[model samples]
Target chain A: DRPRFSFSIAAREGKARTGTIEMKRGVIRTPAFMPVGTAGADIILGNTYHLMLRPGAERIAKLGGLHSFMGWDRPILTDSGGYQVMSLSTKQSEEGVTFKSHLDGSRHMLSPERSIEIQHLLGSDIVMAFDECTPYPATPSRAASSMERSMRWAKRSRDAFDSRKEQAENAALFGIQQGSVFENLRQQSADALAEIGFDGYAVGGLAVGEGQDEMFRVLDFSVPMLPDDKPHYLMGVGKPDDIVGAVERGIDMFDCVLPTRSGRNGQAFTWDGPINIRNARFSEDLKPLDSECHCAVCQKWSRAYIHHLIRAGEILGAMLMTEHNIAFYQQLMQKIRDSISEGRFSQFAQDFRARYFA
Target chain B: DRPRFSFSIAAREGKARTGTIEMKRGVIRTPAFMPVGTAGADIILGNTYHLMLRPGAERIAKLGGLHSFMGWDRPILTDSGGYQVMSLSTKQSEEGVTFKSHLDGSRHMLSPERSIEIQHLLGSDIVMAFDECTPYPATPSRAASSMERSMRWAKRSRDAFDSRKEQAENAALFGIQQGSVFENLRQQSADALAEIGFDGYAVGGLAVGEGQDEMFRVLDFSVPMLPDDKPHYLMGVGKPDDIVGAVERGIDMFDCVLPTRSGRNGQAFTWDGPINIRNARFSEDLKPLDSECHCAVCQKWSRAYIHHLIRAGEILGAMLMTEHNIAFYQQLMQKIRDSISEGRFSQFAQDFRARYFA
Candidate 1:
């Protein structure tokens, strides 16, 4: 039997390793950028909930799955929608979130079993464990209680995975560590997940408004605590700098809605900080989003043209910028991988941060 | 020099004729379908207004132009924005309409010169002359006076075209006849445009509250009065039956928001009448929008899935449906061309209307 998840470590620099995750579907070259298709549109990538809410599970299944339901045929890993259950709701509980479905106000109860079931229905290549992504600024007692409850739910998640033996065979389940900015609690959560075992681990609570320094601090101590052999996914982590720091701290996979959202809002991410296409300065700037980038949009389109389209309120501007931004992220991931393989990641990251901030 | 616009009959029966419009940009196969790209962005096409509102005009121009701006690298005929001025306005005037701009509602004017200037700036491949897309239910006298004013503006439009001769080289203009449903007035308006000698003539005032028989009657008589050698466009006239009927009456070109808008609303054009994708019957019906559609969306996605997406209000739903509808219109135009070329248009029309109206 072939391994469901294959990680080829090209090189290791300090704690960080450069590699790729070879799933049966495709290769996700690490450190990889998983675009969050949050709302089932071009607004973002990795939008299972949106897809489920819109096209429905059975419908997407008939279309051969979310991979084909969307034009993207690449490897796609969707969350168990556990995080959305916490975030989208006005209220939450241990029985599970009673979501007044962001879709149609239809009530829905998503437990660990139901979550795994939905992910299986979506034909997601990697399904996240149904763990609670606790809110930041929580008391340690509250954090510990949430983490413990999540661990029990994690058991249920594993049980559900086992029950769907065929679905589990094709798709890998990633366990999430949730301690709400508490290092001791984080270690405790990571230890519990390690005991249960998973194909991968996720640093779930970062980029949830935990701030850059705190996220790095948490990752610095928490990442080493997880099994080094498995891929370390940092859920909802963001920004060029955030990614760089997280990568340095050994995060292999990341998913965020920033790039797509910013793109739709006329924001184009280049080596030089984000440029707003809505700005007047871009009106005459016939330069590409990046002078050095080789993306299709950049090769043919200029800042001025994009700005004009943005100003005219065209969807193509968003589409073009989204494509460019995704390409940018993918290029960044590749560059980081190349740098790590060459043992020059530190230098590359420094130079990138300097130019990006400058 | 190549003819700016010339029609050559391929086949004829009664008042109907299969023809081609030879133009400087490209040959428009009769009866051609023109997607409405109003506001420089198409609400139906998705990319149009969204791109324009964000990046601005200078950005798009620097990028290369509307075709590249929207990733649509084909023959595109953009409206003159006069229709937007008339209908999308809070106030109307003989010279121009004053309205809140579609983007941000910053006040803007749409005088003949301004409309022409905007279309010119946008680098429209084929343009409509700036004229009032006159209101419906008007008395004959009211319609006649509006037509006179539009004709006066038509001369100005011609002058504007001549003034911007360099930019006007690749671009061609079509004059609109706006005498409403009255045949004699429509004929007079058509003769006035013939005398002015435009590259093409558009029958502008039908499809606006006029009954189908009334619209067909106007086309029956008015189409013959326009120059036989130039293209005859039925502006904003639609419904599948409307298109089929108009095609049987020698109309060579058509543009409408119907297909695109209906698609957004989950209404799909089929061989029979329009089928609403949001209807419960489509929930489990695993067919495509039309079994006959040769579009990528229909080829890959099922009707059940598309129906779910639309009901769930997903952007991919809109994108897929819009693509299919555009393709559907284009395919309809192709079938019309084929039928007429084979001189079986009467049979085609009869069979089409019977099912389409059923």
Candidate 2:
């Protein structure tokens, strides 16, 4: 059997390759800039913490899983409950963590096993393992301890996932690598995850306030340690430039709220860097935000119209802005894939950055 | 030139008629329901009170008027500052009114001539006259006096409109009738508007928190008093049921924020009636908001998904809800027009109301 989840590398340019991940739900083209739908992502990212508390994953499953439950039929990736809970209030123990629901002020507990079960109940196509996201600027000792603990939790998560039987057959499990920019710790975490084996491997801890140069350095050493046959996932990444740099360093998958969140606040990403549509200069500017963007918003609306709506606090302003941004991100991914496939990735990246930052 | 504004009735059943008003920007089909855009209006309602304060009409005019300024290629109807200023603090006078710009707290004055000038600067296709919006529950004596003062303002507005020769050539003007709920006062207001002569006529000062029954009672005695040859507009009037009742009572054009405003708060207008998607019962609903709805939102999303977003307070929830509501309204208008053309408007109204209220 080919198995329910498989990865294929089609073409390579330096360390970057145009690849595909075929799963039961759908085919995902990489380097994929997964726009945040649930926040409108290509493959939506669900919150194990939020869903388990709000609608409850059990309810979602009964209503025909998150795919039908949310009207997104594409593959859905759900995170383990640890990352958000670490920032929210939680008491960490060797077995798991406990915290207030943040939503209803109710008591809640999340372990590696519970997270796996929740992701399964949510019918997540790609599931993340529970890991204690190491805080940035941590001392090497603290980073070592955090990465080792996360490795332990990952082992438990892998075991719990396989124990689910039917869920294990249909869903893909991604093991998360956590280390706070400490190369040795990153090597240790990646080594453990690869030894455990996973459908994909994720670099989870670098995006937490690290400068892009620092992040790229970590990716340079850390990504090479992960299994080459598995998908290389980067969590919660990036501005357009950040994405480009990471993909060039061998990352295969990415998810970010940058496009969707910034869009709501009237920020538009364009070929000439991101522009604030809320600026008074655009008040009478009759041009589209991005003349190159083929999105419905760019096709139908002018900057003046968007500026007026954003200033007026109209909801349509947010809707149109987000629509264009997602299209831009998806388009950027398409360009990256096409350039890599055609073996002109280096030229395309240089030209893209020159104009983007000009 | 056949003048700027002309109304032509194609078919009629009792007082219900399906007609068209041809103007420079576009054609309006009645019984027309102008969905709110700027709040998505077919003819967007520009606020003389608001627009003149921030992003002033002069700026909009310099940007090729409100049409290009807002990217709405169709007709725009701008209101005189009087109605809004009445609610915001104002000092009324024989010449005009003085008020603070709610945005900046700067003093400003809006006379009939100034209102005419502002609408012209806005590149309005349909311009409304400046008049007092008589407060509801006023004494009959107060209503009569308010009507008389509005009549005086109407004369000034008509004269002012004629003086702006270049603007008058391109734009059509509508006179407003304001008489609270008093029948004699309504007759006086309508008679004054007819004598002054306008391209169209508006029945304002209704839809004020007075119940639909009281408002329709006013329409019954007041509608027949207006000039039959001109287009009839009922300002800010109605729920779907109220629209059917008003159309039956000879009302031709209607504008309201009900669909847009309520949709922002998660209220969806369905063929069955308005539904609050925030309700817990809808969390597992597999059906669309309305099974008969042909909107993209309905075609793509299930009620459960809308329920999830609304509960989660996502901006997408409002976008989807507003999209469906606007489609429902435009569809309602189409059905009304078709029924009137087939001479079954009476039966349509009867069947529509039963299902809607049930």
Candidate 3:
């Protein structure tokens, strides 16, 4: 049998903790922000749907692996195609979901078994089980039905993952918990997931139109239900403040397009808050993106130069902006980890929120 | 009195000579390929018409000089904007050329004096005198008339350049000789430019859709007519083979957009030849873009990966490709200089052409 996926907690402060996850590819420090890879923190998350449509899983495997294909040697976590398929206007059945490819408008189907196969072909270090992302403001019955379908899908995903004997030996698989906003359904979903058992558990179905307070409310009752020993992942979450709130509630990992996507549009995250570099106010400002940031972009370029590039629609502008934002997020995660280890998480979070919102 | 511009010839093989031009900003090596920075090689080039409409010349100077504005500390040479204006369907008068901004459709005039002033404001290290680019297939009389007007403008450009005492002392001005492939007219233009005097001389009104053999034929009779001991520049002339041919005909400096523009469009220059990376044959090829290239892109990425990026329309792909092409040109120029220095330029040119065309 292959070595089981493992996580070790190094330090804890109230609910916040610092730790590391050991994987075959590499070690991921806990409370880490995984950059999107050319998509930006430490590890990049590639969408199964997007890759399958463009490069294709089989093509990537033949070329080498996801690590070689993307020129990223660090650990890569791939989401099941379920969330994206659900977001698209597609036909669904218990067997699978039929969707149109965004790149070419070609038709395709994604079942739990197929998702596992694609992830295996991609040689993913962390593979996510396929499940419908229960929509926000979902009815109690609707959320329950979705969560129940996801549980059944999770079972299929586990079987499919195990069937790939070589991949199962090399990669870790995580199941996503999707009970929308209800406390009872979330607990039920978590209990069922624990019964089936995965290497880790993820809190999905948040940040899909749910306000921060509602998301926090759901997390307050939901995150603790996960097995404390395993890692906790908060999918598609969030603003800097949102990440801070999630960390306080015991989340360990996050993957979001906020930093990278915002950067491409000339928006940068700083200690003060998110600011658009295209603003006229930055026209003559010679200061770095953030006075506190030590990223290469900050160290080299001024706000004025970036502003000029952005206004001119230069590619270097987008490249610099994206790199800076990713670096900022990475620095933020390191600070969070240090705060938990030093038993100052509460003070750190409060101070950050105050400065950021001011 | 200011220090005069000077060029020192270190070695010569046939008409090909390797040397260096000393200027206030820095020294430029002979047979140098000036990467189009404003086009993303360095600072990026926007038309004077475009820049005047947007960021504006005074604004760029206020922010700092062009070198500081673009984060490139190397020497920069800006075109007089005559070529772009002549290409547009704009009105021409004795005083200046009136053109509508390509970006905004606003009207502006760029006489020789105005062109010189704008270059000074942009803080150009090498300033070009404003001159009309004679169209190919023109009658002898039309060519002679255009050449004569440029000669008159050259006088005005000299006067305007000298008036800016501080800038004149700091930068070198190059007078452009324009005659549409006529030996007698070319001689007359050269004689006029020599009369007015300039720090350097450029052969213009060529590389404007004239075939290579014809262009080289004109350069055969044209380059030798310009003053010796001064830098001989060939404006907007090139391809690797074209550069080699011109260098063999005594052209000392060159600028072109082919390498970088072609690179952005998925074309790459290799020791073998230029190849399109978007071809299906490169889809599975694991070799570097150029087997002989040692650029960062070649060192790190495979042709397969670059092909995938270009096909996927990724920005990093264009950046990598452009960087590789520019580096290739720089490497080629270095090799050319070395070959001339070692008295093997003929052998080098013959070998390069055979392998590149093969």
Best by DockQ: 2
Q: List ranges where model 2 is wrong by over 4 Å.
A: A1-3, A40-42, B1-3, B40-42
Error of 3 at B284 (Å): 1.8
- Candidate 3 segments exceeding 4 Å error: A1-4, A100-107, B1-4, B38-49, B102-106
RMSD in angstroms, all models? 4.5, 2.2, 2.6
Q: What are the per-residue Cα lDDT tens digits for candidate 1 across A141-191? A: 999999998988888899899899777778788899989888899999999
* lDDT tens digits, residue span B1-358, model 1: 5465466887877666677666565566667777755311111122322333345445556556766554455456766666655564467667776767565767766676766666666566667777776677889889988898889888888878777875567777889888887887888888788788788888887778878988888888888888877778887778878888887777877777777677767888888678888888887776778888888877877777677667765555766777788788878888887887887878988888887778
TM-score rank order: 2, 3, 1
- Evaluated on chain B only, what are the TM-scores of all the candidate structures, in order? 0.87, 0.97, 0.96
Provide the DockQ value for model 1: 0.24
Give candidate 3's fnat, 2 decimals: 0.23
**Candidate 2 lDDT, tens digit per residue, A264-286?**
89899999999999998998888
Q: Please report, in order, the local distance difference test score of every candidate based on alpha carbons.
A: 0.75, 0.86, 0.86
Candidate DockQ scores, in order: 0.24, 0.61, 0.45
Give the poorly placed runs of model 1, Cα more than 4 Å off. Answer: A37-75, A90-110, B1-6, B37-83, B90-133, B152-173
What lDDT score is found at residue A342 in candidate 2? 98
lDDT score of residue B132 within candidate 1: 70
Which docking band does candidate 1 fall into? acceptable
